[PDB]
Amino acid sequence: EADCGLRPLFEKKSLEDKTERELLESYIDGRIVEGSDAEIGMSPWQVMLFRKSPQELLCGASLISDRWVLTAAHCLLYPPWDKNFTENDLLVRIGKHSRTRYERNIEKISMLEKIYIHPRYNWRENLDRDIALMKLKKPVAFSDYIHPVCLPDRETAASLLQAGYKGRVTGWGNLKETWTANVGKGQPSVLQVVNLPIVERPVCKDSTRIRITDNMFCAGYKPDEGKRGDACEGDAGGPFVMKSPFNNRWYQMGIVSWGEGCDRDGKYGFYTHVFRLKKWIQKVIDQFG
């Protein structure tokens, strides 16, 4: 993807968003509250996986080219919950900021041609290879609000995905909505952004009963600080992104995965490691586009 990861309303316009410098510096402020309303056009690869009937937000996703959308497999297929969505059940909504308003002349609604789930996706013993691709029926036109994210290459994967570096999750709080014990305050009105540090793998593992496979990584703050920046702000299947200081581009390093730990503890988010599964992603795009 030639133009990926450069945002029309930011990089292309010589503007920076309110916290990208903090990401690039790996800076963790002493402040408590990290989550906030996203700025317009800040995440133009953001996608809503929407149910046709009844009309509801199912999951998040990301735009990786004019015909391809990336998401988590469990958003589409989870047999223990009698979950199996077919192409005809779903729509994708691209270019959105408002959670609920139809954003006429800004958002685009696309139909699905075909769903592809990782052949080695596992839900039986534990969740693993939690990744899926969706091919759109028609190419989406890019705009100021609609633009694809980059996927990492080998060297970008190794240099960016390190403990203590900071990434970013954006979404409409679908993870919290799915997994919350109690609906306190509702879902957010507007796309949300939170920056989160990558966590050391042994620290992740000791925090949870859920198995952290090698195809997963984790991000978030130590329970110690009373921080109100939370992974739950993202949507299952949505993007975890990092900006490269090498080429100024945004790369999707992770996919928001299983959210069972979005009760209380201040707990780490789990993400599918995108580069580890890239051989499959690239094969599908290259062969079945």
From Swiss-Prot:
Residues flagged as site, Cleavage: 31-32
Recorded consequence of changing residue 93 to C: In FA2D; Quick-1
Disulfide bridge positions per record: 4-150, 59-75, 204-218, 232-262
Resulting phenotype, residue 54 to T: Confirmed at protein level
Recorded consequence of changing residue 177 to A: In FA2D; Salakta/Frankfurt
Residue window of the full protein shown: 333 to 621 of 622
Native source organism of the sequence: Homo sapiens (Human)
High affinity receptor-binding region which is also known as the TP508 peptide: annotated span: 219-241
Domain Peptidase S1: residue ranges: 32-286
Protein name as it appears in the record: Thrombin heavy chain
Active-site residue list: 74 (charge relay system), 130 (charge relay system), 236 (charge relay system)
Residues with attached carbohydrate: 84
